[PDB]
Amino acid sequence: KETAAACFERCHMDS
Amino acid sequence: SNYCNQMMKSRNLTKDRCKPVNTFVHESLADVQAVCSQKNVACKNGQTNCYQSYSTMSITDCRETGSSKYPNCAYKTTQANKHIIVACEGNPYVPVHFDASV
């Protein structure tokens, strides 16, 4: 299962 | 296609549905994680585990058009420099939700 922290990075980070 | 249509699909937000709204942050992961120890603010839902960045950050807002529907999701792309508000949780205390930008 994808963690809540991993989900936030996949959905929101684009450095 | 536009950045939003491209990135929403690449990041698995629109491969299996169309998500109405999503924001992408053009800052390092570490600079976003740093917001969890910045300005404590209330979340939209009333919880108190939200934090606002001191600085404005480079962000792209993606929002579905009025006629957009799966599988042909269509997005309007808006680029801006705004402060971000994230909800944080856990050990380490890290971002778990993107609440808003201001």
PDB file of C-alpha atoms in Angstrom:
ATOM      1  CA  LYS A   1       0.000   0.000   0.000  1.00  0.00           C
ATOM      2  CA  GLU A   2       1.128   3.524  -0.897  1.00  0.00           C
ATOM      3  CA  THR A   3       1.610   5.646   2.270  1.00  0.00           C
ATOM      4  CA  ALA A   4      -0.156   9.039   2.695  1.00  0.00           C
ATOM      5  CA  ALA A   5       3.326  10.742   2.466  1.00  0.00           C
ATOM      6  CA  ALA A   6       4.168   8.892  -0.807  1.00  0.00           C
ATOM      7  CA  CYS A   7       0.759   9.785  -2.234  1.00  0.00           C
ATOM      8  CA  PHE A   8       1.346  13.488  -1.495  1.00  0.00           C
ATOM      9  CA  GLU A   9       4.743  13.356  -3.306  1.00  0.00           C
ATOM     10  CA  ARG A  10       3.443  11.564  -6.391  1.00  0.00           C
ATOM     11  CA  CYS A  11       0.425  13.910  -6.636  1.00  0.00           C
ATOM     12  CA  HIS A  12       2.068  17.230  -5.758  1.00  0.00           C
ATOM     13  CA  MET A  13       5.835  17.328  -6.193  1.00  0.00           C
ATOM     14  CA  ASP A  14       7.471  18.477  -9.407  1.00  0.00           C
ATOM     15  CA  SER A  15      10.839  19.907  -8.349  1.00  0.00           C
TER      16      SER A  15
ATOM     17  CA  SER B   1      -0.745  18.049 -24.683  1.00  0.00           C
ATOM     18  CA  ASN B   2      -0.641  20.790 -21.974  1.00  0.00           C
ATOM     19  CA  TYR B   3       1.453  20.307 -18.795  1.00  0.00           C
ATOM     20  CA  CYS B   4      -1.609  19.501 -16.699  1.00  0.00           C
ATOM     21  CA  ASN B   5      -2.975  16.830 -19.022  1.00  0.00           C
ATOM     22  CA  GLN B   6       0.580  15.347 -19.344  1.00  0.00           C
ATOM     23  CA  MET B   7       1.522  15.413 -15.631  1.00  0.00           C
ATOM     24  CA  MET B   8      -1.915  14.376 -14.322  1.00  0.00           C
ATOM     25  CA  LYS B   9      -1.695  11.247 -16.471  1.00  0.00           C
ATOM     26  CA  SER B  10       2.059  10.594 -15.782  1.00  0.00           C
ATOM     27  CA  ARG B  11       1.499  10.881 -12.016  1.00  0.00           C
ATOM     28  CA  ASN B  12      -1.469   8.458 -12.026  1.00  0.00           C
ATOM     29  CA  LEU B  13      -4.184  10.963 -11.209  1.00  0.00           C
ATOM     30  CA  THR B  14      -6.026  10.603 -14.545  1.00  0.00           C
ATOM     31  CA  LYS B  15      -5.133   7.134 -15.844  1.00  0.00           C
ATOM     32  CA  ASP B  16      -8.196   5.677 -14.011  1.00  0.00           C
ATOM     33  CA  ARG B  17     -10.486   8.819 -13.566  1.00  0.00           C
ATOM     34  CA  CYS B  18     -10.508  12.606 -14.020  1.00  0.00           C
ATOM     35  CA  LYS B  19      -9.619  14.440 -10.810  1.00  0.00           C
ATOM     36  CA  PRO B  20     -11.257  17.921 -10.725  1.00  0.00           C
ATOM     37  CA  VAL B  21      -8.368  19.875  -9.121  1.00  0.00           C
ATOM     38  CA  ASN B  22      -4.680  19.244  -8.358  1.00  0.00           C
ATOM     39  CA  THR B  23      -1.671  21.397  -7.632  1.00  0.00           C
ATOM     40  CA  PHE B  24       2.000  20.670  -8.468  1.00  0.00           C
ATOM     41  CA  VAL B  25       4.845  22.402  -6.545  1.00  0.00           C
ATOM     42  CA  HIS B  26       8.052  23.341  -8.319  1.00  0.00           C
ATOM     43  CA  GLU B  27      10.316  23.340  -5.249  1.00  0.00           C
ATOM     44  CA  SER B  28      12.616  20.693  -3.811  1.00  0.00           C
ATOM     45  CA  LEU B  29      10.979  17.938  -1.774  1.00  0.00           C
ATOM     46  CA  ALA B  30      13.018  19.032   1.241  1.00  0.00           C
ATOM     47  CA  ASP B  31      11.802  22.674   0.916  1.00  0.00           C
ATOM     48  CA  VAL B  32       8.154  21.440   0.877  1.00  0.00           C
ATOM     49  CA  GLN B  33       8.729  19.059   3.822  1.00  0.00           C
ATOM     50  CA  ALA B  34      10.185  22.102   5.646  1.00  0.00           C
ATOM     51  CA  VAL B  35       6.687  23.679   5.675  1.00  0.00           C
ATOM     52  CA  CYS B  36       5.535  21.226   8.429  1.00  0.00           C
ATOM     53  CA  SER B  37       7.537  23.326  10.913  1.00  0.00           C
ATOM     54  CA  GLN B  38       6.391  26.723   9.510  1.00  0.00           C
ATOM     55  CA  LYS B  39       3.163  28.691  10.322  1.00  0.00           C
ATOM     56  CA  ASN B  40       0.552  26.517  12.090  1.00  0.00           C
ATOM     57  CA  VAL B  41      -2.911  27.355  10.697  1.00  0.00           C
ATOM     58  CA  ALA B  42      -6.342  25.740  10.799  1.00  0.00           C
ATOM     59  CA  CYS B  43      -7.143  23.303   7.943  1.00  0.00           C
ATOM     60  CA  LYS B  44     -10.309  23.897   5.829  1.00  0.00           C
ATOM     61  CA  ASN B  45     -11.885  20.889   7.730  1.00  0.00           C
ATOM     62  CA  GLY B  46     -11.309  22.440  11.183  1.00  0.00           C
ATOM     63  CA  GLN B  47      -8.298  20.241  12.110  1.00  0.00           C
ATOM     64  CA  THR B  48      -5.200  22.068  13.441  1.00  0.00           C
ATOM     65  CA  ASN B  49      -2.388  20.049  11.706  1.00  0.00           C
ATOM     66  CA  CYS B  50      -2.019  22.548   8.789  1.00  0.00           C
ATOM     67  CA  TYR B  51       0.983  24.755   7.992  1.00  0.00           C
ATOM     68  CA  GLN B  52       1.459  27.748   5.710  1.00  0.00           C
ATOM     69  CA  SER B  53       4.795  28.486   4.040  1.00  0.00           C
ATOM     70  CA  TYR B  54       6.507  31.746   4.930  1.00  0.00           C
ATOM     71  CA  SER B  55       7.501  32.189   1.268  1.00  0.00           C
ATOM     72  CA  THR B  56       5.596  32.062  -1.980  1.00  0.00           C
ATOM     73  CA  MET B  57       6.471  28.932  -4.031  1.00  0.00           C
ATOM     74  CA  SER B  58       6.273  28.197  -7.754  1.00  0.00           C
ATOM     75  CA  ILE B  59       3.074  26.202  -8.309  1.00  0.00           C
ATOM     76  CA  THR B  60       0.921  24.974 -11.187  1.00  0.00           C
ATOM     77  CA  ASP B  61      -2.783  24.590 -10.622  1.00  0.00           C
ATOM     78  CA  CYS B  62      -4.593  22.043 -12.768  1.00  0.00           C
ATOM     79  CA  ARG B  63      -8.345  22.260 -13.022  1.00  0.00           C
ATOM     80  CA  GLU B  64     -10.718  20.272 -15.206  1.00  0.00           C
ATOM     81  CA  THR B  65     -12.687  22.138 -17.862  1.00  0.00           C
ATOM     82  CA  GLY B  66     -16.512  22.130 -17.567  1.00  0.00           C
ATOM     83  CA  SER B  67     -16.940  19.480 -20.294  1.00  0.00           C
ATOM     84  CA  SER B  68     -13.986  17.255 -19.270  1.00  0.00           C
ATOM     85  CA  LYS B  69     -14.900  13.602 -18.704  1.00  0.00           C
ATOM     86  CA  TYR B  70     -13.052  10.280 -18.557  1.00  0.00           C
ATOM     87  CA  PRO B  71     -11.077   9.129 -20.550  1.00  0.00           C
ATOM     88  CA  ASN B  72     -10.447  12.436 -22.322  1.00  0.00           C
ATOM     89  CA  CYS B  73      -9.654  14.499 -19.225  1.00  0.00           C
ATOM     90  CA  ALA B  74      -8.993  18.127 -20.109  1.00  0.00           C
ATOM     91  CA  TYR B  75      -7.301  20.646 -17.889  1.00  0.00           C
ATOM     92  CA  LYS B  76      -6.779  24.358 -17.606  1.00  0.00           C
ATOM     93  CA  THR B  77      -3.177  25.104 -16.480  1.00  0.00           C
ATOM     94  CA  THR B  78      -2.537  28.187 -14.266  1.00  0.00           C
ATOM     95  CA  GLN B  79       1.018  29.018 -13.087  1.00  0.00           C
ATOM     96  CA  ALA B  80       1.568  31.214 -10.042  1.00  0.00           C
ATOM     97  CA  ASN B  81       3.851  32.057  -7.115  1.00  0.00           C
ATOM     98  CA  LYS B  82       1.836  31.503  -3.898  1.00  0.00           C
ATOM     99  CA  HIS B  83       2.298  30.417  -0.302  1.00  0.00           C
ATOM    100  CA  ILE B  84       1.290  26.777   0.198  1.00  0.00           C
ATOM    101  CA  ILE B  85      -0.807  25.230   3.020  1.00  0.00           C
ATOM    102  CA  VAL B  86      -0.199  21.525   3.766  1.00  0.00           C
ATOM    103  CA  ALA B  87      -1.552  19.104   6.368  1.00  0.00           C
ATOM    104  CA  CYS B  88       1.206  17.165   8.177  1.00  0.00           C
ATOM    105  CA  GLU B  89       1.217  13.841  10.012  1.00  0.00           C
ATOM    106  CA  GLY B  90       3.463  11.093  11.354  1.00  0.00           C
ATOM    107  CA  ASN B  91       7.046  10.368  12.464  1.00  0.00           C
ATOM    108  CA  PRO B  92       8.764  11.969  10.554  1.00  0.00           C
ATOM    109  CA  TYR B  93       6.170  14.811  10.524  1.00  0.00           C
ATOM    110  CA  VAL B  94       5.640  15.253   6.790  1.00  0.00           C
ATOM    111  CA  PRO B  95       3.080  16.580   4.283  1.00  0.00           C
ATOM    112  CA  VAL B  96       0.123  14.226   3.733  1.00  0.00           C
ATOM    113  CA  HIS B  97      -2.377  16.594   2.013  1.00  0.00           C
ATOM    114  CA  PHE B  98      -2.243  19.767  -0.061  1.00  0.00           C
ATOM    115  CA  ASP B  99      -4.857  22.045   1.604  1.00  0.00           C
ATOM    116  CA  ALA B 100      -4.618  25.267  -0.419  1.00  0.00           C
ATOM    117  CA  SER B 101      -2.408  28.003  -1.775  1.00  0.00           C
ATOM    118  CA  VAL B 102      -2.560  31.728  -0.954  1.00  0.00           C
TER     119      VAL B 102
END
